[PDB]
């Protein structure tokens, strides 16, 4: 009676201690991974900015080629009153590109399992 309850409580306490140690170790490992990501972030940000700018410039050049016959069109005209930089929308970067990479950029993370 008392012995069975004591055995149950004792094994519960042993499990609690073991998982305390293991979970603290896991917290430290996660902090290490986050530190690695933080160290790598600036290079990725630079590459991302440069890639976005290249795609925008390519789309602008193609628009300049295409819109030469439209009377009231202005090439590279913003739709916002503000001069502040606006993060480009997904259709602005992949609008004129091929379907496969449009579907990639749109649903690759969602569909990857």
């Amino acid at each position: 009676g008392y012995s069975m309850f004591a055995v149950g409580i004792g094994t519960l306490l042993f499990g609690y201690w073991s998982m305390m140690k293991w979970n603290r170790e896991r917290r430290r490992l996660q902090i290490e991974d986050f530190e690695a990501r933080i160290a790598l972030m600036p290079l990725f940000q630079a590459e991302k900015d440069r890639r976005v700018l290249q795609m925008l410039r390519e789309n602008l050049e193609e628009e300049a080629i295409i819109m030469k016959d439209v009377p009231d069109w202005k090439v590279g005209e913003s739709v916002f009153h503000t001069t502040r930089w606006v993060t480009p929308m997904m259709g602005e970067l992949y609008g004129l590109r091929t379907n496969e990479e449009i579907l990639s950029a749109t649903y690759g993370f969602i569909w990857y399992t």
Binding site: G15, Y16, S18, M19, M20, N23, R24, R26
Partner: protein, 303 residues
């Protein structure tokens, strides 16, 4: 080669169900001081094939006035859900890797009652409808406590990812951290699949049987992954696969043992069991497992 992977996941599960029928018959026979099927096949191994051939050849008794659409749809849904719930599981690497794999499994289990409801309604009999209502009430009642126990246990895993459970139990099994929740989970999985002592209830009949035994094996594998964490070495996953399969087999044989050992409950008795013994303890242990990581500064990593 994803299709080959899907077939290599599906076909072996159905074969395992077919031979689980034979295993259960032989285990019950030897527990009852007799032999099981040992004539059809060298050691009874041809018995499931003979049963399948006989069932698929025998006339199907369509009620001739029942709802044809639902009468066909119910076994389709049963088999589809039973085969789908194996996709989320990691052995060690899952066929499909889901962020919320546990929640997906819970949602599939929640759907599983529609087959019972539709089969009961289609039979065009008051007594069959009453039995179906009993079954649905029991199933939803016990899936309540299944969900609560599941979230209480997962509060130590750190997320709903089923693979992380392997990382959580790298040193010790989750059975030692929480055995009472595991006991209530085992009883609730017995109740959920309508296995004894909670078993109060041609082609399509075999289809339902296959779905039920697939859910039995699936639930036992889920319990093994959840509470008995097998060690995994990334350069040799065969060790994890063998260990996980052995634990799943042991749990299935434990269902057979429980079937062979006990009488069955009444409907009101199992309703009272759940609603007055499991739910209070489940809520109390849910509070305890919410508080414990904060008290002991042992919160799992992922967020």
């Amino acid at each position: 080669m994803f299709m080959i992977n899907i077939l290599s996941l599906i076909i072996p599960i159905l074969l395992a169900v077919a031979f689980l029928t034979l295993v259960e018959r032989k285990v019950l026979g030897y527990m009852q001081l007799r032999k099981g099927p040992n004539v059809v096949g060298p050691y009874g191994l041809l018995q499931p094939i003979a049963d399948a051939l006989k069932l698929f050849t025998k006339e199907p008794l369509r009620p001739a006035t029942s709802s044809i659409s639902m009468f066909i749809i119910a076994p389709i849904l049963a088999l589809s859900l039973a085969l789908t719930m194996w996709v989320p599981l990691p052995m060690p690497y899952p066929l499909i890797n889901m962020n919320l794999g546990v929640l997906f499994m819970l949602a599939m289990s929640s759907l599983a009652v529609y087959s019972i409801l539709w089969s009961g309604w289609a039979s065009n009999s008051k007594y069959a409808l009453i039995g179906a209502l009993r079954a649905v009430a029991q199933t939803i009642s016990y899936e309540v406590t299944l969900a609560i126990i599941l979230l209480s246990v997962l509060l130590m895993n750190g997320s709903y990812t089923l693979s992380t459970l392997i990382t959580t139990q790298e040193h010790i099994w989750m059975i030692f951290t929480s055995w009472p929740l595991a006991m209530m989970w085992f009883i609730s999985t017995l109740a959920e699949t309508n296995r004894a002592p909670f078993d109060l209830t041609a082609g399509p009949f075999a289809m339902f049987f296959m779905a039920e035994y697939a859910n039995i094996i699936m639930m036992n594998a889920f319990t093994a992954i959840l509470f008995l964490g097998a060690s995994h070495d990334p350069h040799t996953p065969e060790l994890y696969t063998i260990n996980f399969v052995l634990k799943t087999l042991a749990l299935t044989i434990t269902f057979l043992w429980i079937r062979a050992s006990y009488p069955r409950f009444r409907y009101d008795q199992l309703m009272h069991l759940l609603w007055k013994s499991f739910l209070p303890l489940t809520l109390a242990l849910c509070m305890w497992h919410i508080s414990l990581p904060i008290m002991t500064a042992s919160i799992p990593p992922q967020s």
